[PDB]
Specification:
The protein is of the alpha+beta class and 250 residues long. The chain contains 9 helices and 7 strands; from the N terminus they run H-E-E-H-E-E-E-H-E-H-E-H-H-H-H-H. This is Spectinomycin 9-adenylyltransferase.
């Protein structure tokens, strides 16, 4: 069917074909460029455009990227494709939270079938994305590197972007237990040392640095992201999520 080289290229060509010269650059970030592209990692694309997309231009992007990506239940070699589109002019003057023009994500697929087209939205998670992408990124198209397309984002805004998304996360940990546990730990480290680390090894770092009760649940979420079917319905994630939330507060 498709391997990851084909995935990189069809996504690369879908964007130059259906956005023409509105496309300034397309970049890859996340744990695929950071700490190596393991066969388990996800494909996080970042796309910079000049002018806004009209809803149907955002709709063909959904429909053509749709078969290219891995569905949540897919027990195959395909990996998730997460692409966010930002507009360069909507980025200066810098201001948290930043503006976002488009987003593809497979957690939004149930909404995609019902007719949802991601429209202009303010996302605070985007602040840490651009911060870690300005640092380490792989450019697959464009005449400029990502760092000359975004202003210097201050570390004062990531620290609040960390915590703004923190207490957004404490409310809706439900049904995303495995991922939200490891994300908070990555945020504990990103705001203590300043390094953004894969959630795989971010969990084990705080694991042995935390009480046993939460230690067990941190390591249980280490496995479930590596496959390893784990049913959280009787584990008390509320306690560990409450613990990591307060440990981050500083
Ligand atoms: C940070 N943005 C998203 C967002 O938090 C999603 N929440 C529904 C989150 O969802 C996941 O945990 C999923 O279960 C689905 C997967 C494609 O993305 C994973 O990472 C997804 C994150 O990348």
């Amino acid at each position: 069917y498709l391997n990851t080289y084909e995935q990189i290229n069809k996504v690369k060509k879908i964007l130059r074909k259906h956005l023409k010269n509105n496309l300034i650059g397309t970049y890859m970030f996340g744990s695929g460029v950071e700490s190596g592209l393991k066969p388990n990692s996800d494909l996080d694309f970042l796309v910079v455009v000049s002018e806004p997309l009209t809803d149907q231009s955002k709709e063909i992007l959904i429909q053509k990227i749709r078969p290219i990506s891995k569905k949540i239940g897919d027990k195959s070699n395909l990996r998730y494709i997460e692409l966010t589109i930002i507009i360069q002019q909507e980025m200066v003057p810098w201001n948290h939270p930043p503006k976002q023009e488009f987003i593809y994500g497979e957690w939004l697929q149930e909404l995609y079938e019902q007719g949802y087209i991601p429209q202009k939205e303010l996302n605070s998670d985007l602040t840490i994305m651009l911060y870690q992408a300005k640092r380490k990124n792989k450019r697959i198209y464009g005449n400029y590197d990502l760092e000359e397309l975004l202003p210097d984002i201050p570390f004062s805004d990531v620290r609040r972007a960390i915590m703004d998304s923190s207490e957004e996360l404490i409310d809706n940990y439900q049904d995303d237990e495995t991922n939200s546990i490891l994300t908070l730990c990555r945020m504990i480290l990103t705001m203590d040392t300043g390094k953004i680390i894969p959630k795989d090894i971010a969990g084990n770092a705080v694991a042995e640095s935390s009480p046993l009760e939460h230690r067990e649940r941190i390591l249980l979420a280490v496995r479930s992201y590596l496959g390893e079917n784990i049913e959280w319905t009787n584990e008390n994630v509320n306690l560990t999520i409450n613990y990591l939330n307060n440990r981050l507060k500083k």
